[PDB]
């Protein structure tokens, strides 16, 4: 049979609340794929693979329900940080079908450089799904 697939690209995900939601929902839905980002503060990619119903549900989650631009606060050993996200965004970039699915669950990974990200995507035959800048 045939696997439905979607891919999204974000400018930032330092927000722990966003991270939680993406996790929990991937968990509850039986979707497969990954979320990769260049360092804690960099851009990245979400890839999702499953049946049509689940993919559209996730599309809704990510493009409609999540406030990618919502301000949040971080706490450290030297003090507090207020993060304003007015210029963060999410973008849905690819949409289609696969005969083959190389992902084995749904996982996240923070990479050190863009090449580390591209190398990873390539282990799953997916270098092309990303758009560098
Ligand atoms: Y249909
Ligand atoms: Y703001």
Q: Which residues surround ligand 2, an ion (CB under 5 A)?
A: 71, 84, 86
* Distance separating alpha carbons of residues 48 and 33, to the nearest angstrom: 5
Closest C-alpha to 124, from 59, 107, 75, 11: 107
Q: What is the 8-class DSSP label of residue 129?
A: G
* CA dist 115 → 5, 38, 46, 79, 83 (Å): 23, 9, 17, 33, 27
Q: Tell the residue number behind the tokens 């999204």, with chain if given.
A: 8
Q: Give burial (CB, 10 Å; 0-12/13-18/19+) of 36.
A: buried
Cα-to-centroid distance, 114 and ligand 2 (Å): 27
* Distance separating alpha carbons of residues 31 and 114, to the nearest angstrom: 25
Ligand with an atom nearest the CA of residue 85: 2
Into how many domains does the chain fold?
A: 1
Entry resolution (Å): 2.7
Cα-to-centroid distance, 85 and ligand 1 (Å): 36
Closest C-alpha to 31, from 128, 117, 111, 98: 98
Cα-to-centroid distance, 71 and ligand 2 (Å): 5
Report helix, strand or coil for 132. coil
Tell me which residue range forms the domain holding 49. Answer: 1-133
Q: How was this structure determined?
A: X-ray
Gaps (C–N > 2.5 Å) in the chain: which residues precede them?
A: none
Report helix, strand or coil for 31. coil
* Distance separating alpha carbons of residues 55 and 8, to the nearest angstrom: 12
Q: Region of 74 please: left (phi>0), alpha (psi -120 to 50) or beta.
A: beta
Cα-to-centroid distance, 31 and ligand 1 (Å): 17
Q: Region of 30 please: left (phi>0), alpha (psi -120 to 50) or beta.
A: left
* CA dist 81 → 14, 74, 84 (Å): 12, 5, 10
């Amino acid at each position: 049979t045939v696997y439905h697939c979607k891919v999204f690209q974000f400018k930032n995900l330092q927000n722990p609340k966003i991270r939680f939601k993406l996790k929990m929902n991937s968990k509850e839905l039986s979707l497969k794929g990954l979320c990769l980002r260049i360092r804690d503060d960099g851009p990245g990619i979400i890839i999702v693979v499953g049946n049509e119903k689940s993919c559209k549900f996730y599309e809704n989650l990510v493009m409609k329900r999540i406030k990618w631009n919502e301000d949040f606060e971080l706490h450290t050993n030297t003090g507090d940080i207020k993060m304003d996200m007015h210029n963060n965004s999410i973008s849905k970039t690819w949409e289609g079908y696969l005969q083959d699915c190389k992902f084995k669950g749904w996982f996240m990974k923070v990479c050190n450089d863009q090449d580390s990200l591209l190398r990873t995507l390539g282990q799953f035959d997916s270098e092309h799904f990303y758009s560098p800048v």
